[PDB]
Paper text:
Interestingly, two oligomeric states, hexamer and heptamer, were revealed in both cryo-EM samples, which were also observed in 2D class averages of M2 alone. We finally determined three complex structures, M2-hB7.1 hexamer, M2-hB7.2 hexamer, and M2-hB7.2 heptamer, at an overall resolution of 3.04, 2.7, and 3.12 Å, respectively. Unexpectedly, the cryo-EM analysis shows that M2 displays as hexamers and heptamers and binds to hB7.1/2 with both 6:6 and 7:7 stoichiometries. Despite the different oligomeric conformations, the overall structure of each M2 subunit and inter-subunit interactions from hexamer and heptamer structures are virtually identical. We found that the oligomeric M2 proteins can engage into hB7.1/2 with higher avidities than the monovalent interactions of M2 with hB7.1/2.
Here we reveal that MPXV M2, co-existing as a hexamer and a heptamer, recognizes human B7.1 and B7.2 (hB7.1/2) with high avidities.
Author numbering:
A (entry chain D), C (entry chain C): 20 to 220
B (entry chain K), D (entry chain J): 27 to 132
């Protein structure tokens, strides 16, 4: 017996909180615009992929060697020009850490060629590497918390849907990079934050 | 998770394995509260106190051989969990390499 | 790493105040007509270009050797038959002065052949030249303040947009020409002025 | 930017480099207040007072060798910045060639 990924459907009623991306930008976004984010999902050859167009950025984030496909994403703008991204897949059918590759390109403001391309380790358990690459100089900092233990309280889940998140510390992963001379500051203020669910898929 | 004992002196270890075996001379080693206030800062082996919050000002110590923060004169308020964050400073970009979360009960 | 111009989009949410054109006319325009100005933009071979049809004039203004494209323009009519033009590009990715070429043709009143074709220097820093040419005798005076430090207060920016302007004196440029025996008088009265955003692009 | 001193006599220089080395005989040299009132006027070497505002009437002097306006009997009101504008008169059209902005604090 082998657990397999469920067949693709039009609407997914069961969501798994997989990632918590708080990419910062040095240009101003004032507030969360309803209906701004556009998400395109893919699952080809056991590799999940999500492309997020919104708030001046394209996020092509892919996970290697998984039985999960990205089914949802919610994007919000916090204070000090912070872009929080919440990602949801189907279900966790394995208890192993997965390799992550994220491409962050600027479609507005500081557009340009690749400024950064590196492997960001797990902060905890040191078991995987994030291939980050940034097409632009418009990103202040990147924070990706894979399989978080806590959902952001300002995100209101839909009524007909179901949400599951990780409850064990052993499956948490943290990747972070800063390009400015401040400790952390990838983390948000979470005092006045609102989330918008991306359009397609 | 690692906890500490009562109101004498709290030990907060990062427990870095240092698998690549890099030196502390280019390493940013620092601690932080659950309400996300910086405890101590090490930039390149020198403590910096500008980002340290005033409630923890002049009340913490650092030991480099044991990689441990010593937290003196414990109070009743600081019962939350404390996390230590280890970044690797590179001129291309500052990479977070290690984080760990410990607890504190007095 | 090289900063590049952002890819073209349908609507541009980030605007950079690049120029302040106050072309005067000897015929009467009483007030700013809503929906009068029509703007056509171009970026071919690193040269920005804008064609402004409105209030009896066509303004074919182009900038050489830039990483900016004209994304917006606002036109207004002040007192004493003054035509203020505000121009907005994407962003300033270089700290050098750019060569400017402006063609002002009269489509109403004093239409005719080229009366003027010259190089107007920078008034400040003497670092660039404006190739001006005027197809008509209907222009009193031309004033072009490239990268101004102050926005005109009577121009009301749209709510969902963002505006950035120059803050350094070193990037200011001034070009001016008068064809009548009055000192200055290219500058407006700015007591009762209203602006209209041009239609296309 | 260039400033001037207290209530004795203010010096307002244009500081024209004159790179093409043209003569003052065909040059329009004049000064103006921040509220956009003309201070002095030179048309072809002769001062013209018709466009000069009445508040600055008969109270300014011009020096051609040093290209400087001397502003006598300073008051408390005139603390704003003053800009000097240099046009090149041609029968085809009058071309502004030089402008500069200076300050005045008394």
């Amino acid at each position: 017996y082998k657990n397999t990924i469920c067949p693709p459907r039009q609407d997914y009623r069961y969501w798994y909180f997989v990632a918590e991306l708080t990419i910062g930008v040095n240009y101003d976004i004032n507030s969360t615009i309803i209906g701004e984010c556009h998400m395109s999902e893919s699952y080809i050859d056991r590799n999940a992929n999500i492309v997020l167009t919104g708030y001046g950025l394209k996020i092509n984030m892919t996970i290697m060697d998984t039985d999960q496909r990205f089914v949802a994403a919610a994007e919000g703008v916090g204070k000090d020009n912070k872009l929080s991204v919440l990602l949801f897949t189907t279900q966790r059918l394995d208890k192993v850490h997965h390799n992550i590759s994220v491409t962050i390109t600027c479609m507005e403001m500081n557009c340009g060629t690749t400024k950064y391309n590196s492997d960001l380790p797990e902060s905890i358990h040191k078991s995987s590497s994030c291939d980050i690459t940034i097409n632009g100089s418009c990103v202040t900092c990147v924070n990706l918390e894979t399989d978080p233990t806590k959902i952001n309280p300002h995100y209101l889940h839909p009524k007909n849907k179901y949400l599951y998140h990780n409850s064990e510390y052993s499956m948490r992963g943290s990747y972070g990079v800063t390009f400015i001379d401040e400790l952390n500051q990838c983390l948000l203020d979470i005092k006045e934050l609102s989330y918008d669910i991306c359009y397609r898929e | 998770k690692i906890q500490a004992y009562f109101n004498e002196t709290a030990d907060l270890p990062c427990q870095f394995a240092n698998s690549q075996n890099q030196s502390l001379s280019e390493l940013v080693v620092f601690w932080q509260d659950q309400e996300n206030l910086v405890l101590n800062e090490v930039y390149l082996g020198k403590e910096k106190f500008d980002s340290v919050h005033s409630k923890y000002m002049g009340r913490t110590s650092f030991d480099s051989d044991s990689w441990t923060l010593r937290l003196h004169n414990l109070q009743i308020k600081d019962k939350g969990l404390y996390q230590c964050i280890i970044h690797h400073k590179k001129p291309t970009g500052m990479i977070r390499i290690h984080q760990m979360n410990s607890e504190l009960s007095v």
